[PDB]
Amino acid sequence: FRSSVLHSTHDLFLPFFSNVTWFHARFDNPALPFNDGVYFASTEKSNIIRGWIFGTTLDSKTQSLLIVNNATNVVIKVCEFQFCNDPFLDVMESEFRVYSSANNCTFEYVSQPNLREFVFKNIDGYFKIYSKHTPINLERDLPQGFSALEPLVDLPIGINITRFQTLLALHAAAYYVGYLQPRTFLLKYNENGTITDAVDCA
Amino acid sequence: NFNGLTGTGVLTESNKKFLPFQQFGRDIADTTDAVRDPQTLEILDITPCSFGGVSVITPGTNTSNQVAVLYQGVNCTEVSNVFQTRAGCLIGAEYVNNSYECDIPIGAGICASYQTQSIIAYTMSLGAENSVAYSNNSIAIPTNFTISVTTEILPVSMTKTSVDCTMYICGDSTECSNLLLQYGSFCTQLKRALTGIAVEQDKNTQEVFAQVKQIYK
Amino acid sequence: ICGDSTECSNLLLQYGSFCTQLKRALTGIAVEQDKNTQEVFAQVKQIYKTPPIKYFGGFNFSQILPDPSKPSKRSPIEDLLFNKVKFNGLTVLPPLLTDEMIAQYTSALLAGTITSGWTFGAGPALQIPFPMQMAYRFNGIGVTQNVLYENQKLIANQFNSAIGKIQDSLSSTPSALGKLQDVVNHNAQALNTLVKQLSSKFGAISSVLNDILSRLDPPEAEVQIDRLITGRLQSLQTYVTQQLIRAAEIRASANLAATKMSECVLGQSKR
Amino acid sequence: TPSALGKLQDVVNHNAQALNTLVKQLSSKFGAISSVLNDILSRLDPPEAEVQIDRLITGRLQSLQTYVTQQLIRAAEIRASANLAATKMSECVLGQSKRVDFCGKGYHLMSFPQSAPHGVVFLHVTYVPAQEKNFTTAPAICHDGKAHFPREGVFVSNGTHWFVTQRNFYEPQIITTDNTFVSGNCDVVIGIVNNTVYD
Amino acid sequence: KFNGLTVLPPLLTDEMIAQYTSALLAGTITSGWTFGA
Amino acid sequence: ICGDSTECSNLLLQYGSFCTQLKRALTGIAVEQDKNTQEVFAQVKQIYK
Amino acid sequence: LDPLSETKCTLKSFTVEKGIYQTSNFRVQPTESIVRFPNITNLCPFHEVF
Numbered sequence A: 001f002r003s004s005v006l007h008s009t010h011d012l013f014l015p016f017f018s019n020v021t022w023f024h025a026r027f028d029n030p031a032l033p034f035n036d037g038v039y040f041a042s043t044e045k046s047n048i049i050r051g052w053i054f055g056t057t058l059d060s061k062t063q064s065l066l067i068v069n070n071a072t073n074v075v076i077k078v079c080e081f082q083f084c085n086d087p088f089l090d091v092m093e094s095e096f097r098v099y100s101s102a103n104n105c106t107f108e109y110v111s112q113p114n115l116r117e118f119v120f121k122n123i124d125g126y127f128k129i130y131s132k133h134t135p136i137n138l139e140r141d142l143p144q145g146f147s148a149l150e151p152l153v154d155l156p157i158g159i160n161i162t163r164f165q166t167l168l169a170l171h172a173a174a175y176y177v178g179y180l181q182p183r184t185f186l187l188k189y190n191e192n193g194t195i196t197d198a199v200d201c202a
Numbered sequence B: 001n002f003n004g005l006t007g008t009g010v011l012t013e014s015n016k017k018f019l020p021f022q023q024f025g026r027d028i029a030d031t032t033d034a035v036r037d038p039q040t041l042e043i044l045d046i047t048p049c050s051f052g053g054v055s056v057i058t059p060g061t062n063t064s065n066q067v068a069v070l071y072q073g074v075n076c077t078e079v080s081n082v083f084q085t086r087a088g089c090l091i092g093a094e095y096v097n098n099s100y101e102c103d104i105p106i107g108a109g110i111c112a113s114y115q116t117q118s119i120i121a122y123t124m125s126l127g128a129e130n131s132v133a134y135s136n137n138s139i140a141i142p143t144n145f146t147i148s149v150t151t152e153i154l155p156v157s158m159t160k161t162s163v164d165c166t167m168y169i170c171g172d173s174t175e176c177s178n179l180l181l182q183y184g185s186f187c188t189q190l191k192r193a194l195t196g197i198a199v200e201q202d203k204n205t206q207e208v209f210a211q212v213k214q215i216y217k
Numbered sequence C: 001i002c003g004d005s006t007e008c009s010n011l012l013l014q015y016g017s018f019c020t021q022l023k024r025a026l027t028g029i030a031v032e033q034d035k036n037t038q039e040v041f042a043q044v045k046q047i048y049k050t051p052p053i054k055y056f057g058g059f060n061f062s063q064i065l066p067d068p069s070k071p072s073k074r075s076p077i078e079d080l081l082f083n084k085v086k087f088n089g090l091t092v093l094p095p096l097l098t099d100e101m102i103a104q105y106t107s108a109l110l111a112g113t114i115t116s117g118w119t120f121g122a123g124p125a126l127q128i129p130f131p132m133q134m135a136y137r138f139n140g141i142g143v144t145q146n147v148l149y150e151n152q153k154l155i156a157n158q159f160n161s162a163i164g165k166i167q168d169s170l171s172s173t174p175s176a177l178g179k180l181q182d183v184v185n186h187n188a189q190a191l192n193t194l195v196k197q198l199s200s201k202f203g204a205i206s207s208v209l210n211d212i213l214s215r216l217d218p219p220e221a222e223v224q225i226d227r228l229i230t231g232r233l234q235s236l237q238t239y240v241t242q243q244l245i246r247a248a249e250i251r252a253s254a255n256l257a258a259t260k261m262s263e264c265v266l267g268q269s270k271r
Numbered sequence D: 001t002p003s004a005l006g007k008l009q010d011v012v013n014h015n016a017q018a019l020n021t022l023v024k025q026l027s028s029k030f031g032a033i034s035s036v037l038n039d040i041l042s043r044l045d046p047p048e049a050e051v052q053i054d055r056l057i058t059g060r061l062q063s064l065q066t067y068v069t070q071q072l073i074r075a076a077e078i079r080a081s082a083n084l085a086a087t088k089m090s091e092c093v094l095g096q097s098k099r100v101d102f103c104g105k106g107y108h109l110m111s112f113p114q115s116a117p118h119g120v121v122f123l124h125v126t127y128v129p130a131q132e133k134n135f136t137t138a139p140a141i142c143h144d145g146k147a148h149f150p151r152e153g154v155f156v157s158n159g160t161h162w163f164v165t166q167r168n169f170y171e172p173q174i175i176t177t178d179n180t181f182v183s184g185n186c187d188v189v190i191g192i193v194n195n196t197v198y199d
Numbered sequence E: 001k002f003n004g005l006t007v008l009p010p011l012l013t014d015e016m017i018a019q020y021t022s023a024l025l026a027g028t029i030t031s032g033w034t035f036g037a
Numbered sequence F: 001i002c003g004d005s006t007e008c009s010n011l012l013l014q015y016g017s018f019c020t021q022l023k024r025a026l027t028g029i030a031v032e033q034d035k036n037t038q039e040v041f042a043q044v045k046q047i048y049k
Numbered sequence G: 001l002d003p004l005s006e007t008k009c010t011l012k013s014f015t016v017e018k019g020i021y022q023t024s025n026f027r028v029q030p031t032e033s034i035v036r037f038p039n040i041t042n043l044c045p046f047h048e049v050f
């Protein structure tokens, strides 16, 4: 906790005015890379994107991270298998068969799951997850103003992650994918401890 | 010990209102300011415990053996005529309302003295009250005078010191000198500074006293 | 250096007596500050009080004379000056002469210089009307007393108008008190850097001594503690050297201020 | 009176204490097994004794650097004090200084230097007024429709007559046309008085 | 003193400083401020 | 201290802000020299020809 | 024994002059060692085995 004080750090952050790619759905799943971290954004008019997948060797040779989620509770499992080739969620309208194989896993984190942002980090032994929700009320590019994402779960896992994909549902969508880089940042903390302003020193 | 945070101090209930995802905080100096109890979710502030140097008030061994102690920056309730001032807790001297000249500087306008015998504490007296009778047409003209001689002492120089760097560091050892020669010209810079100070003392002594070219008898 | 421990002192004792040198330097600086304050502000022998009714020949000293209408009994200019300008082993000592004593000294100096001219600085305070004192000063600067005895009203109006703008000048320009703002900011940043250096590692495993004493073997924990001690001792030495340099500068500035007080307030310098 | 010569005593004590600290740091073993080089060389082999010799050299180098920095600061202070003493000599002994409270407290007349160990003592002979008496004053005197101002002295009155005396001593002389000069008229001084001026 | 540290004697001894002081005193009692200029 | 060394630059960061103190002292000396030059020679307000 | 003797020791002299002298640093000592940890829950299924 910090209050009414400025602080600086050299951790992973998304550079300001970076060339963040815009990916619209007719599914657009080329299995984007994952160097050290990615910035995910979702602003569609529904909840079609309700999952994430992480891993390095997804051809059933190395453990992978699943962030499968629905409208009730998240299903985070760390197992080693290829789903079929790539995720495909076809939802009485209640079905879930994106993967046709199972193996020996190590995690069953099922604690808890109109613009929503997600920042993932792959530190040595804790897959960090950050989330935040802010209204938009307009139809344009990413709005102005700062919005600091708060930590959600530590997810203690030691699996390497170099590729990630987006889980989409069906019977149109869009999402923003970014990449973090290590550079010095300046953070401003208010009296309540919330980050309001930030300056990218580079 | 809060989930691994090791320290020692005073825990006190505070209202800093930490956010749900954070449980401990730090000040601008990266010093732990508060930590939240992981059991009852209570947030409490951590304050370092009182510390301060003890300054003994000695009126002189040749006069009396009675002494007073001063715990700087602490409260008297955390440490005999105990007295609390802005400089700390004063023990061994009673506070008097009479003001005198500051003999032993204690702090925050308070000074101690050995008067009729016990050590007493009092506020500093800046001087005697003097109300000049100012008026539209009042002038004061002296009718006499006094010739006063005031002594003023000023240092002119100090001891000219010269230190043998190799002999001080090694002391007649060659194996030590072989390693000393690796560090560089430190022994040369120090010798140069010492010689500069030595010639500077003589220059000062020359500039102060030798201001005439003839020795008048 | 060690902090929240008792075994690190055994390794610290092997470094000699640098602690005594640092403590002696700090005490010397502390007594030097009070000596400078006394040499600057305690130049008067007695505390002179202003008369009830001022009427200083038309001159208005309300901006600099004290008033009991507000606490601390300070003047409006001094009030604006005072309004315009956490322990980890280090402490701040309170000055010997508090703000009230310095204010009383300044008020006594002002009363003596407005009711006696330069007589009280050389000896007994000789009562003299302020127009007569101004005439003596005009004769000292090489101007006949007739120029003042014919333009007393104009000179009083000019003095009042010049004094009234001092507050506006010092308020509209925050850089006027920069010479003191820089000093207080340097002291604050020196303290904050000395206390921040405790979070560094200097090539060790962790900045906390208790973490090293609970994660490594003694033969390596001692090396880590030695590295931390060397780093913090170098930090303390740098801090003490910078404090000594700043103290020498402050002593020079205080000697200059005391000389200026004695030559301008207690008299009339021709320099 | 004690502590009269405390300034030079403080300097010599600081020098002696610096020397004592420098000679005491020699016996401090900075992480080595011993503080004597002979006890390390005659006990350990060169490749193992060099490790302790390096620590001793580092410690003694740090001690010497600290001593030299303190000596430089003290030498700068001594140079400032010596420049002040030379200015005091030149302005009080070689001449009379009009600077207030520079050559002692009071109106400086003359000063005499005195030799002292590593210092100088000045005997400032000053002029201090005493036995002050107050009288009634007036900025000017209006006589024959014109204002008269004092040339060198000041106007004083003991209650029945008016005289002119110097500012630093009481010498009531008769107010005449030689010790006063005329300027302006009778109606420009707010505190002017009616008094005759002898010719 | 035997640890490589020695004290150098001052150039002007106490007798010469005393002679300078006596010369200044004689000049200021016999010539005033004229000998300084 | 390093001279274009990547491994040395990362190790220098564990010493704190000593480099910052040195840089601040050097900038203070630099501005002090200019302040002295201004206070000594620029006492007049107008350039009298 | 007494603060006067402590002053004599910190000054390394039997005769002490008139004034104040910092002899030692006082601080209050800790009384209890408190170990704080979250709720002891989510016990491993040792009962389901043994």
Ligand SMILES: *[C@@H]1O[C@H](CO)[C@@H](O[C@@H]2O[C@H](CO)[C@@H](O[C@@H]3O[C@H](CO)[C@@H](O)[C@H](O)[C@@H]3O)[C@H](O)[C@H]2NC(C)=O)[C@H](O)[C@H]1NC(C)=O
Binding pocket: B039, B040, G038, G039, G040
């Ligand atoms: C596990 O965590 C729970 C949740 O904090 C702990 O239960 C809590 O225990 C405290 C202390 O007994 C309760 O506070 C008390 O609440 C009552 C009202 O119910 C109030 O009248 C008392 O003055 C006091 O404030 C708290 O209510 C209770 N919370 C719940 C949800 O039961 C529990 O002690 C923890 N267990 C262990 C082994 O740490």
Ligand SMILES: *[C@@H]1O[C@H](CO)[C@@H](O[C@@H]2O[C@H](CO)[C@@H](O)[C@H](O)[C@H]2NC(C)=O)[C@H](O)[C@H]1NC(C)=O
Binding pocket: A019
């Ligand atoms: C972000 O990156 C993309 C792809 O590298 C850039 O798009 C290219 O821009 C250049 C320059 O205008 C064109 O010649 C190319 O045809 C574009 N497409 C590709 C695939 O290279 C885009 O300009 C970048 N945006 C920013 C702000 O840097």
Ligand SMILES: *[C@@H]1O[C@H](CO)[C@@H](O[C@@H]2O[C@H](CO)[C@@H](O)[C@H](O)[C@H]2NC(C)=O)[C@H](O)[C@H]1NC(C)=O
Binding pocket: A070, A071, A072, A073, A074, A075, A094, A096, A110
């Ligand atoms: C939504 O997800 C939750 C879990 O995040 C599902 O709840 C579990 O469903 C499985 C069936 O795959 C059951 O075996 C578990 O017992 C359920 N857990 C609980 C706590 O009920 C839920 O069924 C999912 N809903 C839909 C419509 O897919």
Ligand SMILES: *[C@@H]1O[C@H](CO)[C@@H](O[C@@H]2O[C@H](CO)[C@@H](O)[C@H](O)[C@H]2NC(C)=O)[C@H](O)[C@H]1NC(C)=O
Binding pocket: A063, A080, A104, A105
């Ligand atoms: C579940 O899969 C993991 C991942 O392969 C297994 O962990 C490996 O176990 C083998 C056993 O010989 C080791 O050689 C590997 O080094 C382990 N992997 C890593 C990354 O260390 C785990 O054993 C499997 N569990 C079961 C019950 O089969």
Ligand SMILES: *[C@@H]1O[C@H](CO)[C@@H](O[C@@H]2O[C@H](CO)[C@@H](O)[C@H](O)[C@H]2NC(C)=O)[C@H](O)[C@H]1NC(C)=O
Binding pocket: B143, B144, B145, B146, D131
């Ligand atoms: C000025 O003061 C001096 C003393 O400072 C006076 O000299 C004294 O005069 C009395 C009266 O005749 C003698 O009894 C004393 O012996 C004198 N003292 C000395 C030291 O000589 C002097 O009279 C005063 N003058 C005036 C005009 O008041």
Ligand SMILES: *[C@@H]1O[C@H](CO)[C@@H](O[C@@H]2O[C@H](CO)[C@@H](O)[C@H](O)[C@H]2NC(C)=O)[C@H](O)[C@H]1NC(C)=O
Binding pocket: C060, C061, C062, C063, C164
């Ligand atoms: C001396 O100056 C003060 C301040 O400039 C004068 O006080 C002002 O008086 C006027 C007229 O009564 C008021 O309107 C202002 O509000 C006062 N200002 C303050 C700050 O008090 C004071 O009158 C002046 N003295 C004389 C004799 O005129």
Ligand SMILES: *[C@@H]1O[C@H](CO)[C@@H](O[C@@H]2O[C@H](CO)[C@@H](O)[C@H](O)[C@H]2NC(C)=O)[C@H](O)[C@H]1NC(C)=O
Binding pocket: D158, D159, D160, D161
């Ligand atoms: C003020 O001084 C004058 C001048 O000395 C005094 O006048 C003299 O007073 C004495 C005493 O009565 C007479 O003997 C002289 O003849 C007076 N001289 C002249 C020229 O008149 C006067 O008395 C003093 N007044 C007071 C109140 O002290």
Ligand SMILES: *[C@@H]1O[C@H](CO)[C@@H](O[C@@H]2O[C@H](CO)[C@@H](O)[C@H](O)[C@H]2NC(C)=O)[C@H](O)[C@H]1NC(C)=O
Binding pocket: D192, D193, D194
């Ligand atoms: C000084 O002398 C002048 C001139 O004699 C006096 O002024 C006269 O005062 C009377 C009484 O008030 C008037 O009737 C005359 O008209 C005035 N004459 C002139 C030329 O103005 C004055 O009163 C005397 N006293 C003072 C203190 O000035």
Ligand SMILES: *[C@@H]1O[C@H](CO)[C@@H](O)[C@H](O)[C@H]1NC(C)=O
Binding pocket: A056, A062, A160
């Ligand atoms: C994962 O990364 C670590 C660290 O770089 C490396 O040692 C290990 O070989 C990697 N494993 C795989 C399967 O890539």
Ligand SMILES: *[C@@H]1O[C@H](CO)[C@@H](O)[C@H](O)[C@H]1NC(C)=O
Binding pocket: A190, A191, A192
């Ligand atoms: C902190 O939260 C309180 C909640 O009532 C709010 O009133 C206040 O404005 C907030 N302060 C900041 C700086 O956000």
Ligand SMILES: *[C@@H]1O[C@H](CO)[C@@H](O)[C@H](O)[C@H]1NC(C)=O
Binding pocket: B075, B076, B077, B084
């Ligand atoms: C000392 O403690 C008492 C009681 O806690 C308190 O009333 C008093 O104000 C404290 N003194 C100081 C100087 O803080």
Ligand SMILES: *[C@@H]1O[C@H](CO)[C@@H](O)[C@H](O)[C@H]1NC(C)=O
Binding pocket: B134, B135, B136, C053, C054, C055
């Ligand atoms: C001075 O004169 C003024 C008016 O001119 C008057 O009010 C005051 O009482 C006189 N005396 C003093 C001591 O101010």
Ligand SMILES: *[C@@H]1O[C@H](CO)[C@@H](O)[C@H](O)[C@H]1NC(C)=O
Binding pocket: B133, B138, D134, D135, D136
């Ligand atoms: C002279 O001063 C004294 C004391 O200040 C006072 O009692 C006396 O009335 C004054 N006399 C005159 C004429 O002002």
